[PDB]
PDB file of C-alpha atoms in Angstrom:
ATOM      1  CA  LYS F   1      -0.012   6.294  -5.877  1.00  0.00           C
ATOM      2  CA  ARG F   2      -0.094   8.284  -2.669  1.00  0.00           C
ATOM      3  CA  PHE F   3      -2.528   7.658   0.232  1.00  0.00           C
ATOM      4  CA  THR F   4      -3.850  10.252   2.638  1.00  0.00           C
ATOM      5  CA  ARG F   5      -3.425   9.607   6.383  1.00  0.00           C
ATOM      6  CA  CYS F   6      -6.947   8.034   6.562  1.00  0.00           C
ATOM      7  CA  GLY F   7      -6.824   6.393   3.137  1.00  0.00           C
ATOM      8  CA  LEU F   8      -3.761   4.451   4.362  1.00  0.00           C
ATOM      9  CA  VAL F   9      -5.240   3.426   7.723  1.00  0.00           C
ATOM     10  CA  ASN F  10      -8.238   2.127   5.763  1.00  0.00           C
ATOM     11  CA  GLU F  11      -5.974   0.038   3.448  1.00  0.00           C
ATOM     12  CA  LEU F  12      -3.857  -1.407   6.271  1.00  0.00           C
ATOM     13  CA  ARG F  13      -7.013  -2.529   8.019  1.00  0.00           C
ATOM     14  CA  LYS F  14      -8.397  -4.022   4.872  1.00  0.00           C
ATOM     15  CA  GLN F  15      -4.965  -5.716   4.326  1.00  0.00           C
ATOM     16  CA  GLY F  16      -5.308  -7.304   7.763  1.00  0.00           C
ATOM     17  CA  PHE F  17      -2.536  -5.447   9.666  1.00  0.00           C
ATOM     18  CA  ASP F  18      -2.686  -5.940  13.415  1.00  0.00           C
ATOM     19  CA  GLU F  19      -4.792  -3.165  14.954  1.00  0.00           C
ATOM     20  CA  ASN F  20      -2.597  -2.459  18.052  1.00  0.00           C
ATOM     21  CA  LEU F  21       0.378  -1.959  15.837  1.00  0.00           C
ATOM     22  CA  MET F  22      -1.628   0.389  13.588  1.00  0.00           C
ATOM     23  CA  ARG F  23      -0.276   3.722  14.829  1.00  0.00           C
ATOM     24  CA  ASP F  24       3.250   2.305  14.520  1.00  0.00           C
ATOM     25  CA  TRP F  25       2.612   1.168  10.929  1.00  0.00           C
ATOM     26  CA  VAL F  26       1.087   4.567   9.934  1.00  0.00           C
ATOM     27  CA  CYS F  27       4.172   6.338  11.500  1.00  0.00           C
ATOM     28  CA  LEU F  28       6.568   3.963   9.734  1.00  0.00           C
ATOM     29  CA  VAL F  29       4.960   4.476   6.298  1.00  0.00           C
ATOM     30  CA  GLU F  30       4.800   8.237   6.633  1.00  0.00           C
ATOM     31  CA  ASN F  31       8.524   8.383   7.502  1.00  0.00           C
ATOM     32  CA  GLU F  32       9.665   5.720   5.075  1.00  0.00           C
ATOM     33  CA  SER F  33       7.759   6.649   1.966  1.00  0.00           C
ATOM     34  CA  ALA F  34       5.553   9.678   2.747  1.00  0.00           C
ATOM     35  CA  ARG F  35       2.668   7.337   1.645  1.00  0.00           C
ATOM     36  CA  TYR F  36       3.875   6.781  -1.981  1.00  0.00           C
ATOM     37  CA  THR F  37       3.564   3.255  -3.295  1.00  0.00           C
ATOM     38  CA  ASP F  38       6.060   3.772  -6.134  1.00  0.00           C
ATOM     39  CA  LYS F  39       8.829   5.520  -4.192  1.00  0.00           C
ATOM     40  CA  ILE F  40      12.269   4.111  -4.740  1.00  0.00           C
ATOM     41  CA  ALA F  41      15.017   5.123  -2.218  1.00  0.00           C
ATOM     42  CA  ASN F  42      18.466   6.252  -3.402  1.00  0.00           C
ATOM     43  CA  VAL F  43      21.276   3.719  -3.097  1.00  0.00           C
ATOM     44  CA  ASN F  44      22.550   3.063   0.497  1.00  0.00           C
ATOM     45  CA  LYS F  45      26.265   2.558   1.483  1.00  0.00           C
ATOM     46  CA  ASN F  46      25.820  -1.131   0.293  1.00  0.00           C
ATOM     47  CA  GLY F  47      24.483  -1.096  -3.344  1.00  0.00           C
ATOM     48  CA  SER F  48      21.043  -1.927  -1.958  1.00  0.00           C
ATOM     49  CA  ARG F  49      17.926   0.134  -2.513  1.00  0.00           C
ATOM     50  CA  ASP F  50      14.546   0.463  -0.832  1.00  0.00           C
ATOM     51  CA  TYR F  51      11.222  -0.058  -2.628  1.00  0.00           C
ATOM     52  CA  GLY F  52       7.667   1.182  -2.427  1.00  0.00           C
ATOM     53  CA  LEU F  53       5.356   2.071   0.392  1.00  0.00           C
ATOM     54  CA  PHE F  54       7.320  -0.027   2.949  1.00  0.00           C
ATOM     55  CA  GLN F  55      10.714   0.813   1.639  1.00  0.00           C
ATOM     56  CA  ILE F  56      11.733  -2.831   1.572  1.00  0.00           C
ATOM     57  CA  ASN F  57      15.533  -3.526   1.116  1.00  0.00           C
ATOM     58  CA  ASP F  58      16.570  -5.491  -1.921  1.00  0.00           C
ATOM     59  CA  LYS F  59      19.441  -7.165   0.025  1.00  0.00           C
ATOM     60  CA  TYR F  60      17.398 -10.038   1.503  1.00  0.00           C
ATOM     61  CA  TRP F  61      13.844  -9.409   0.486  1.00  0.00           C
ATOM     62  CA  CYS F  62      13.157  -8.877  -3.213  1.00  0.00           C
ATOM     63  CA  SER F  63      14.921  -9.792  -6.397  1.00  0.00           C
ATOM     64  CA  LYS F  64      16.439  -7.156  -8.618  1.00  0.00           C
ATOM     65  CA  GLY F  65      16.435  -9.479 -11.642  1.00  0.00           C
ATOM     66  CA  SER F  66      13.079 -10.234 -13.222  1.00  0.00           C
ATOM     67  CA  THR F  67      12.727 -13.673 -11.380  1.00  0.00           C
ATOM     68  CA  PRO F  68      10.840 -13.672  -7.962  1.00  0.00           C
ATOM     69  CA  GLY F  69      13.041 -12.537  -5.144  1.00  0.00           C
ATOM     70  CA  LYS F  70      14.568 -13.920  -2.007  1.00  0.00           C
ATOM     71  CA  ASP F  71      12.889 -14.221   1.341  1.00  0.00           C
ATOM     72  CA  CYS F  72       9.659 -12.557   0.066  1.00  0.00           C
ATOM     73  CA  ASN F  73       9.688 -14.583  -3.190  1.00  0.00           C
ATOM     74  CA  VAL F  74       9.041 -11.461  -5.345  1.00  0.00           C
ATOM     75  CA  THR F  75      10.621  -9.079  -7.709  1.00  0.00           C
ATOM     76  CA  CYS F  76      11.384  -5.620  -6.252  1.00  0.00           C
ATOM     77  CA  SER F  77       9.405  -4.086  -9.074  1.00  0.00           C
ATOM     78  CA  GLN F  78       6.326  -5.817  -7.706  1.00  0.00           C
ATOM     79  CA  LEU F  79       6.631  -3.716  -4.524  1.00  0.00           C
ATOM     80  CA  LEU F  80       6.068  -0.497  -6.501  1.00  0.00           C
ATOM     81  CA  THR F  81       2.533  -1.111  -7.744  1.00  0.00           C
ATOM     82  CA  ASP F  82      -0.594   0.789  -6.844  1.00  0.00           C
ATOM     83  CA  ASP F  83      -2.177  -2.356  -5.400  1.00  0.00           C
ATOM     84  CA  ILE F  84      -0.181  -3.099  -2.260  1.00  0.00           C
ATOM     85  CA  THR F  85      -1.330  -6.708  -1.514  1.00  0.00           C
ATOM     86  CA  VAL F  86       2.053  -8.185  -2.316  1.00  0.00           C
ATOM     87  CA  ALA F  87       4.048  -5.560  -0.522  1.00  0.00           C
ATOM     88  CA  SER F  88       1.927  -6.030   2.597  1.00  0.00           C
ATOM     89  CA  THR F  89       2.375  -9.760   3.018  1.00  0.00           C
ATOM     90  CA  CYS F  90       6.053  -9.053   2.604  1.00  0.00           C
ATOM     91  CA  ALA F  91       6.082  -6.189   5.081  1.00  0.00           C
ATOM     92  CA  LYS F  92       4.361  -8.530   7.553  1.00  0.00           C
ATOM     93  CA  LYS F  93       6.928 -11.224   6.955  1.00  0.00           C
ATOM     94  CA  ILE F  94       9.659  -8.757   7.819  1.00  0.00           C
ATOM     95  CA  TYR F  95       7.998  -7.629  11.034  1.00  0.00           C
ATOM     96  CA  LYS F  96       7.459 -11.201  12.097  1.00  0.00           C
ATOM     97  CA  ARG F  97      11.282 -11.531  12.033  1.00  0.00           C
ATOM     98  CA  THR F  98      12.861  -8.243  12.945  1.00  0.00           C
ATOM     99  CA  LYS F  99       9.835  -6.175  14.210  1.00  0.00           C
ATOM    100  CA  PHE F 100      10.267  -2.504  13.174  1.00  0.00           C
ATOM    101  CA  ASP F 101      14.007  -2.579  13.913  1.00  0.00           C
ATOM    102  CA  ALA F 102      14.370  -3.169  10.216  1.00  0.00           C
ATOM    103  CA  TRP F 103      13.225   0.336   9.368  1.00  0.00           C
ATOM    104  CA  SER F 104      15.554   3.174  10.331  1.00  0.00           C
ATOM    105  CA  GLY F 105      12.643   5.568   9.624  1.00  0.00           C
ATOM    106  CA  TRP F 106      10.659   4.004  12.404  1.00  0.00           C
ATOM    107  CA  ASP F 107      13.632   3.776  14.799  1.00  0.00           C
ATOM    108  CA  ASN F 108      14.147   7.481  14.254  1.00  0.00           C
ATOM    109  CA  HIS F 109      10.734   9.214  13.904  1.00  0.00           C
ATOM    110  CA  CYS F 110       8.436   6.739  15.796  1.00  0.00           C
ATOM    111  CA  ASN F 111       9.844   6.490  19.303  1.00  0.00           C
ATOM    112  CA  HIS F 112       7.644   9.229  20.836  1.00  0.00           C
ATOM    113  CA  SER F 113       4.004   8.806  20.150  1.00  0.00           C
ATOM    114  CA  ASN F 114       2.345   8.382  16.800  1.00  0.00           C
ATOM    115  CA  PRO F 115      -0.642   9.943  15.048  1.00  0.00           C
ATOM    116  CA  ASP F 116      -4.020   8.997  16.346  1.00  0.00           C
ATOM    117  CA  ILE F 117      -5.868   6.830  13.954  1.00  0.00           C
ATOM    118  CA  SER F 118      -9.449   7.409  15.017  1.00  0.00           C
ATOM    119  CA  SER F 119     -11.078   9.979  12.760  1.00  0.00           C
ATOM    120  CA  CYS F 120     -10.478   7.424  10.032  1.00  0.00           C
TER     121      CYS F 120
END
């Protein structure tokens, strides 16, 4: 599925994402997945891939093989669903550790002001 700018802000708030990080989250998502929940990045230098809305790397976060992953305790295929509850708790887990430094999309397209979320 693909959210609109406001459909996404609505979801993130419902999902409990921290309000003052909101514009950063919106920016990140739009530059990592263009708001698609089922997007799957092309292989990086290291055979790793990025999954779903948050483009979460399969190197340390999700399992490629049927049984619940690594640090996020989930399968990467679970981060491609229309319901993003699982991907969210994981995305939060990642932020708690490496902030947004994990996402190159954020480091590149989110360092000079984000979109304004009120209107949503």
